């Protein structure tokens, strides 16, 4: 299950989950994922560098749910993996 | 003079510069400012960790613009230095 292939209206509640609870999560799930520091300070360059990150990611096949889940899993964010979970529910596809 | 003292147009403008250039320079100063690790990601919280930054450090005495501009320096952001100044300029309180 590729994250490109999700409606944007899931898309929204991952960039609304980090503007409203904790926009810290990200550096940690780069950490995991092995991105390069330089990365890091190309995200930062935005107020909101879970938007760069989550395009960034998708140009690439490794953008599986089961590897971000494996990631937030290691980092001890499963909190965020059941906010995820219980927020999929929506409405239309546009 | 002291940050604090400063009107609201040119905080919006410190804001603008991070939310709309690069928005990784609070990092190196909380560092250069000497800040515990769990200040940097109590900022994080939110998408616009300058908003808190600077609202936690117009608090304190420390807040002067002698102190920031060290701090600038320090982190070799001068460029930063010049683009505040130039804008110091302004004529529009709120």
Redesign the interface.
Known sequence: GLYSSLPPAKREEVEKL??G????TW?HLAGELGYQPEHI?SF??????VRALLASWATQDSATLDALLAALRRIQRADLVESLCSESTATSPV
């Open positions: 980090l503007n609870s904790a926009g810290d550096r300070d930062t360059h935005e107020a909101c560098p």
